[PDB]
Structure formats: C-alpha cells, structure tokens
Amino acid sequence: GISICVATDCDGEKVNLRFLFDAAGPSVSRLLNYSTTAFNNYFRLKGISRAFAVNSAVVFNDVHCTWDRLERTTQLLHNSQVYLFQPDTLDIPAAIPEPYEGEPLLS
Amino acid sequence: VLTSPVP
Ligand code: NA
Ligand code: NA
C-alpha cells in the first residue's frame, strides 16, 4: 500500500488528509479528483459555503528539501506530502499537521 | 514538521 498525504489551507489553518492506495499507486489526476471531493466535503462539514478547487499543486522532495511542481505520476512516492493551492485564497506558510484519514470524506 | 509552501 502507498500512502499519500494531501494538505491545503482552510480559513488560515492547514488541513492534512491521508489516502491509501494499492501497491501500484495513484495517478496525479486521480489524486487531485479524490482530494477535490474530500476537501469539498470537509469545507461543508466545517460550515464553509465556498467550493474547494485546485489551481496549483506541489509535492515535497525529501532529497532536496524543496517543494516541486506536481506534474508527473512518478513524483508520487510512498509517504509523499502534497500541497494544493487554491484560487481566491491568502496562503500564508504554517505548519502542516498530522493527517486525518481522507477516505471517510470520499462521498 | 513541514511548513506549507508559498507560491
Ligand atoms: Na517525494
Ligand atoms: Na493561488
């Protein structure tokens, strides 16, 4: 099983979700669709009326300690941390917390 | 551990 974490900004606080995939893994587009569904449901749970959407994605690179643009599925290694930027959002750097399980939010 | 990135 491959574990990918995906984080984003929610009204100034960082929210982190973990997704578990088969040993093969996700493709970037699939990971983005799952993330969009999960964070829209999260926003609804928290009482936020605006929709969640991704306009840019990055993935943390362990070897260089930098955030790389997320473009290819080969970038999605085990225990990867993804960050999703949103439109119409003031994104101030803050600590990314331990993840919740993302699967209950997939509906 | 990780701080979120800036665009
Ligand atoms: Na990585
Ligand atoms: Na943005």
Structural domain spans, chain A: 1-107
Q: Degrees (nearest 5) of the Cα angle A50, A20, A76?
A: 85
Model resolution, angstroms: 1.9
A82 contacts A6 by C-beta, under 8 angstroms:
yes
Best CA proximity match to A75, nearest among A61, A93, A87: A61
Compute, in angstroms, the gap from residue A22 CA to the centroid of ligand 2. 31
Retrieve residue A40's tokens. Answer: 């829209």
Contact residues on chain B for A14, CB-CB shorter than 8 A: 4
How would you class A55 by CB atoms within 10 Å of its CB: exposed for 0-12, middle for 13-18, buried for 19 or more? exposed
The three state secondary structure string of A54-104 is CCEEEEEECCCCEEEECCCHHHCCCCEEEEEECCCCCCCCCECCCCEECHH
Which H or E element spans position A23?
none
Experimental method: X-ray
Contact residues on chain B for A7, CB-CB shorter than 8 A: 4
